[PDB]
Structure 1
Amino acid sequence: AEKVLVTGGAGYIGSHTVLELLEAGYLPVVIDNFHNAFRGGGSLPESLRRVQELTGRSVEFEEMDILDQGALQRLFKKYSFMAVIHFAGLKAVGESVQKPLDYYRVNLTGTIQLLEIMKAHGVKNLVFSSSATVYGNPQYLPLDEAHPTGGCTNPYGKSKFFIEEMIRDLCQADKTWNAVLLRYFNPTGAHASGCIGEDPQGIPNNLMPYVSQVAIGRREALNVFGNDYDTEDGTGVRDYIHVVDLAKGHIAALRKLKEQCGCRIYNLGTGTGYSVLQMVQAMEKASGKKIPYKVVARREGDVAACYANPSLAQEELGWTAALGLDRMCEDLWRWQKQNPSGFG
């Protein structure tokens, strides 16, 4: 066994991770159902067509849904996987509140079925792409891996917590499993080529893609949800990690599995949070554009500040984020300007 399955590998973090896997000398097999990825003019998703050009290496790809048991069984019989990196899922928080059953079905049932097939095929090596929203509202900052988990405020976050708990119980029951749960906040930026990046369908949910679309002329003005928080400038402080650093952390996790590590949990991040206005300022600097905004009411449930402590990963995974705020913004801008409408 010598392939790495990457579920959801056509998406934002997955496509960057497939690139890093290829550059690191692994042999990926990617599956995706195109729920949130654009089709290319050939078989590959456009993101992965471009990854093949960027790396000079071929991407093995199957269009399939991880909810389809028969397809998943056939996949694991056809390929000999040594590990799985699991990105396939739904991840829009506001959508999760409106459509909880879809989130529980894709995220929970999808992951359970993946685990069941992995077990059946003796593939017991997993990197799970988790979320630091599993810590709930912060009780101390920065959040480290000892901080309590649970008490999530939306179905997305609850789904990620529930999956973590299931994996932890699986590993307790069977000490031959190795699983690395990676917790992080907001992936930002893009591969330095500007050829791939986050390609939101419709009006972006999140700050940075919205700000980039204001800068390019695609959107009127940003809404800033509250400026009366207990933060330096009154706007909320959040944690942003360059997607390339994040992708490299998934490769470091894959290496940790080879140590027969059992169940391990690591935060990934830079260790420093930024306010909404700090991100807007840095995007004006990178883009050379004004980014108008208006301050509106706080959203119910939003906390003043949340950011992660990446010290454990810096020791045990050998991983450090190299790319700071200006690089995140410069790389997002380059993707945006080179691809004003995204992939399509």
Structure 2
Amino acid sequence: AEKVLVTGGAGYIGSHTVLELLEAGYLPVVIDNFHNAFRGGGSLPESLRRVQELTGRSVEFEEMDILDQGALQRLFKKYSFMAVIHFAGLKAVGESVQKPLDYYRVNLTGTIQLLEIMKAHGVKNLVFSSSATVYGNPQYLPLDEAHPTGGCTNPYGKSKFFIEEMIRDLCQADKTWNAVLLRYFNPTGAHASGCIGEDPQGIPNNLMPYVSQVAIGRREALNVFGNDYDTEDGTGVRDYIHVVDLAKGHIAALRKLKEQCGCRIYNLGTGTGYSVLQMVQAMEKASGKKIPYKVVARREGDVAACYANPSLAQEELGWTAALGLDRMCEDLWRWQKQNPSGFGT
């Protein structure tokens, strides 16, 4: 009746969201298998221990895989969840092209297993981590919720779109379900404290963490994936949104579920697009470092540009992304500088 299950909560967006939830008086229970998150010293992952410290509130956590029915059943028997925020999954567009089965497995099969447990336990309130990739190659920009979905350019985007469809079907089959599908754009930045941030395990697939690792000196130079796109400078254009703003959108989503909203879909973006080179520039500026780069071939699955029309979320969720580029860059750099090796090494 009270707890909020947060899958993949030790990750980038999840950790920030657990923070916001706690600050807002909610009671999160987090699960993660650490596939893409650093393991803390103690029971808690590093990221979560830090959130526990920043908020002053306990973080209930369990190490587990969403693909383990057993563990999930156990978890649901142990806690009385009121809702589920589902972040757990694989998220690299380019990797998906090469390892489709891993994506279908973790993203599709893992979500199906979670929905089955939820249904079984009567916890029919969900917030799902969707993505702008479900729009496939943009037919128009900015992207609104009315733009066609499907015809994705990569297996990851298909996996997200397929999940949206399953959810719509589930909601059609049972009107008692409420589900908010959040199509995020490109989150960046970090908690203002600089204590938590984006700390991928291994080499970063995302632009910004890679860029920050270059500025801090952990990486020699950034590889720019193509410069022959139909954009102002030829490099990819994305709608960067502060991870803090994005995290806050989850609280608004929780409120929407309480209205017995049914199945709803909202973009979570700023509406302002920035190119690869513009991001590098903003980061040189924030870090005071030179961010060497070189142009390589395009990365399969990538689109030239994508940015959101965030009006719907403002109208129905009463949410808007407050923070801008400067703030994103500044927050990112603060985290990087305070944590040159991320959470640990």
TM-score range, shorter chain: over 0.9
How far residue 270 of structure 1 moved from its aligned partner, in angstroms, is 0.5
Confirm or deny: 8 A CA contact 1:225 1:296 kept in the other structure: yes
Quote the Cα distance in structure 1 between the aligned partners of 2:51 and 2:172. 37
**Pairing of 1:3-152 with structure 2 (within 5 A):** 3-152=3-152
How far residue 106 of structure 1 moved from its aligned partner, in angstroms, is 1.1
Q: SS state of the match for residue 6, structure 2? A: strand
**Pairing of 1:299-318 with structure 2 (within 5 A):** 299-318=299-318
How far residue 48 of structure 1 moved from its aligned partner, in angstroms, is 0.3
How far residue 93 of structure 1 moved from its aligned partner, in angstroms, is 2.2
Quote the Cα distance in structure 2 between the aligned partners of 1:48 and 1:107. 23
Render the CA deviation track for 1:74-119: whole Å, top value 9, x for unaligned. 1111101000000111112222222221211111111111111111
**Pairing of 1:157-176 with structure 2 (within 5 A):** 157-176=157-176
In 2 relative to 1, CA 300–42 (structure 1 residues): closer, same or farther, beyond 3 Å?
Answer: closer
Quote the Cα distance in structure 1 between the aligned partners of 2:42 and 2:295. 44
Confirm or deny: 8 A CA contact 2:2 2:80 kept in the other structure: yes
How far residue 64 of structure 1 moved from its aligned partner, in angstroms, is 1.1
Confirm or deny: 8 A CA contact 1:180 1:253 kept in the other structure: yes
Quote the Cα distance in structure 1 between the aligned partners of 2:93 and 2:226. 18
Confirm or deny: 8 A CA contact 1:3 1:80 kept in the other structure: yes
- Report the number of matched residues: 344
Quote the Cα distance in structure 1 between the aligned partners of 2:93 and 2:295. 21
Q: SS state of the match for residue 295, structure 1? A: strand
Render the CA deviation track for 1:198-243: whole Å, top value 9, x for unaligned. 1122222121111111101111121222323322222221111111
Higher mean displacement: 254-263 or 195-204: 195-204
How far residue 300 of structure 1 moved from its aligned partner, in angstroms, is 4.4
Quote the Cα distance in structure 1 between the aligned partners of 2:98 and 2:111. 21
How far residue 301 of structure 1 moved from its aligned partner, in angstroms, is 4.8
Render the CA deviation track for 1:16-43: whole Å, top value 9, x for unaligned. 0000000010000111111111111110
Quote the Cα distance in structure 1 between the aligned partners of 2:257 and 2:121. 17
In 2 relative to 1, CA 95–268 (structure 1 residues): closer, same or farther, beyond 3 Å?
Answer: same
Quote the Cα distance in structure 2 between the aligned partners of 1:302 and 1:91. 13
Higher mean displacement: 263-272 or 67-76: 67-76
How far residue 65 of structure 1 moved from its aligned partner, in angstroms, is 1.0
Confirm or deny: 8 A CA contact 2:5 2:85 kept in the other structure: yes
Matched-pair identity in %: 100
Quote the Cα distance in structure 2 between the aligned partners of 1:342 and 1:60. 23
Render the CA deviation track for 1:178-200: whole Å, top value 9, x for unaligned. 00000012210110000001112
Confirm or deny: 8 A CA contact 1:28 1:59 kept in the other structure: yes
In 2 relative to 1, CA 45–171 (structure 1 residues): closer, same or farther, beyond 3 Å?
Answer: same
Higher mean displacement: 173-182 or 93-102: 93-102
Higher mean displacement: 264-273 or 214-223: 214-223
Q: SS state of the match for residue 103, structure 1? A: helix
Q: SS state of the match for residue 130, structure 1? A: strand
Confirm or deny: 8 A CA contact 1:245 1:323 kept in the other structure: yes
In 2 relative to 1, CA 109–228 (structure 1 residues): closer, same or farther, beyond 3 Å?
Answer: closer
Q: SS state of the match for residue 267, structure 1? A: strand
Tell me the TM-score normalized by structure 2.
0.97
Confirm or deny: 8 A CA contact 1:282 1:326 kept in the other structure: yes
Quote the Cα distance in structure 2 between the aligned partners of 1:62 and 1:216. 33
- The CA RMSD measured in Å over matched residues stands at 1.1
Quote the Cα distance in structure 2 between the aligned partners of 1:55 and 1:312. 31
Confirm or deny: 8 A CA contact 1:184 1:308 kept in the other structure: no
Confirm or deny: 8 A CA contact 1:4 1:83 kept in the other structure: yes
Q: SS state of the match for residue 31, structure 2? A: strand
How far residue 128 of structure 1 moved from its aligned partner, in angstroms, is 0.3
How far residue 298 of structure 1 moved from its aligned partner, in angstroms, is 3.0
Higher mean displacement: 89-98 or 18-27: 89-98
Quote the Cα distance in structure 1 between the aligned partners of 2:182 and 2:35. 23
In 2 relative to 1, CA 301–53 (structure 1 residues): closer, same or farther, beyond 3 Å?
Answer: closer
Quote the Cα distance in structure 2 between the aligned partners of 1:105 and 1:296. 30
Confirm or deny: 8 A CA contact 1:142 1:309 kept in the other structure: yes
How far residue 123 of structure 1 moved from its aligned partner, in angstroms, is 0.6
Quote the Cα distance in structure 2 between the aligned partners of 1:121 and 1:336. 41
Unaligned runs of 5+ in 2: none
